């Protein structure tokens, strides 16, 4: 649990949504 | 799976972050993720680390600098081709269940369509429809049917899924060639523009016939033909005559509600001391409600029309 978690939490919610959509499509 | 990784990511980013992400996700995706989330029992450290690594690798690629496509496109189209062309292009770009399709239809057509149905079915459809669309539909119904529907809606207890499916299928069957329903071309405003392009004698005939008909839309067009913002194109003598015929407070309020060019034109048409006093009163006063400014502008436009009819003003 390094600073990577904090960096990911600071990312744009739209980026997270796009990544989630891409993963769901790849499912 | 990717759904499980996304679920783990949503769990580990926090409730606020996951809620913000769901605001950018469709209903189906949110439902699927929530269903997967409720069945989660354990997330091992290896799985967590792999999910973090995969998400960071994906975010390295994008890193897409997300832009509000709708707002940016609207602004570009407006600043490029005016408001009308921008709105038309947006409508073209923007352009389903039977109930959802009915929400995308004209109030009178849907009202007459569901009017040939059992009142309980009408109430159920209206409940399933949009509130504004249902209100528009109900306003067009007869008093007896409207009262019956309002009574039935007040005692609505839910419908069976099979009945809902059958109702949706029937509504789909009753559909017609509703593609490209309605069209925004013109009317009233276009009529006013055409009248403004017809001769003085022809516009005299126009006043005559419009007064002769319904009278209400005649006054609506009286208001519509020429606007307050068009006073900037009038000659200076007419503006000075308007200053003579308009009270100081009404003129001040109208200038406050108008554009800086029109205000400067009116100030130039006024004397130096009077213009300075008007500016000082504007600065020392406070904001004025839009309704009051509109009423004062309407009075000033009535004075404009009175002066123009007498021949003292040229429009």
């Amino acid at each position: 649990m390094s600073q990577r978690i904090r960096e990911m939490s600071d990312n744009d919610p739209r980026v997270v949504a796009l990544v989630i959509r891409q993963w769901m499509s790849n499912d | 799976s990717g759904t499980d990784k996304s679920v783990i990511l949503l769990m580990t980013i926090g409730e606020d972050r996951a809620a913000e992400v769901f605001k950018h996700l469709s209903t189906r995706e949110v439902q699927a993720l929530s269903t997967a989330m409720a069945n989660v029992r354990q997330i091992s450290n290896k799985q967590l680390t792999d999910v973090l690594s995969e998400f960071e690798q994906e975010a390295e690629q994008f890193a897409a600098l997300n832009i509000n496509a709708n707002e940016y496109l609207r602004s570009v189209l407006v600043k490029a081709l005016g408001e009308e062309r921008a709105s038309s292009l947006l409508e073209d770009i923007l352009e389903t269940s039977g109930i959802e399709t009915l929400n995308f239809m004209e109030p009178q057509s849907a009202a007459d369509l569901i009017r040939d149905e059992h009142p309980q079915i009408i109430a159920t459809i209206l409940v399933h429809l949009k509130r504004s669309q249902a209100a528009d539909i109900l306003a067009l119904f007869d008093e007896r049917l409207r009262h019956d529907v309002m009574l039935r809606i007040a005692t609505f207890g839910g419908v069976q899924p099979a009945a809902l499916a059958e109702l949706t299928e029937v509504l789909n069957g009753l559909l017609d060639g509703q593609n490209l329903k309605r069209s925004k071309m013109g009317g009233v405003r276009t009529a006013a523009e055409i009248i403004n392009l017809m001769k003085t004698q022809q516009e005299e005939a126009v006043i005559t016939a419009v007064r002769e008909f319904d009278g209400e839309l005649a006054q609506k067009i009286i208001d519509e033909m020429f606007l307050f913002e068009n006073l900037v194109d009038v000659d200076d003598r007419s503006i000075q005559r308007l200053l003579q015929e308009v009270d100081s407070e009404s003129l001040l309020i109208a200038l406050k509600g108008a554009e800086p060019p029109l205000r400067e034109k009116f100030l130039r048409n006024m004397s130096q001391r009077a213009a300075d006093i008007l500016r000082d009163d504007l600065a020392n006063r406070g904001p004025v409600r839009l309704s009051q400014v509109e009423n004062e502008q309407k009075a000033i436009l009535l004075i404009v029309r009175r002066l123009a009819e007498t021949g003292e003003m040229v429009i």
Partner: protein
């Protein structure tokens, strides 16, 4: 009841749902009569109506949704009578 056909016909409210059935192998055409009140009650019950509001006389043709309600009743009635 045993009566001439015209006597039965004159007592049927207008309009009414009339369904033609055949009782094979016997030759002929049977009729199943559903009163409009029963159809309205079934429609009200299927769409969550509590039945508080009394039914209003309409004298109108049944909608296709009401037609499907009548068909749903008719299939069960047919199975029952056959059994």
């Amino acid at each position: 009841r045993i009566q001439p056909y015209h006597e039965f016909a004159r007592n049927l409210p207008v309009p009414t749902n009339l369904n033609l059935i055949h009782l094979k192998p016997l030759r002929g055409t049977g009729l199943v009569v559903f009163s409009p009140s029963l159809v309205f009650i079934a429609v009200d019950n299927l769409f969550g109506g509590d039945g508080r509001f009394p039914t209003k006389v309409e004298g109108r043709e049944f909608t296709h949704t009401e037609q499907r309600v009548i068909n749903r009743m008719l299939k069960l009635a047919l199975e029952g009578y056959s059994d």
